[PDB]
Design a protein around this ligand. Sequence first.
Ligand SMILES: [Zn+2]
Lengths: 30, 21
Amino acid sequence: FVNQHLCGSHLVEALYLVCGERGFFYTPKT
Amino acid sequence: XIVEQCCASICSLYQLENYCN
Ligand SMILES: [Zn+2]
């Protein structure tokens, strides 16, 4: 896989694709 | 964190994987 430059909603789209049904946590300040 | 890193810098899908449940 190639590296990523993801900001805003694009990061959430990436997390959705990577995690699928396993679900995920979107945590900014963390 | 990852949200900041992916935007201010770059990040990999493998790093994103650590945020799955
Ligand atoms: Zn956009």
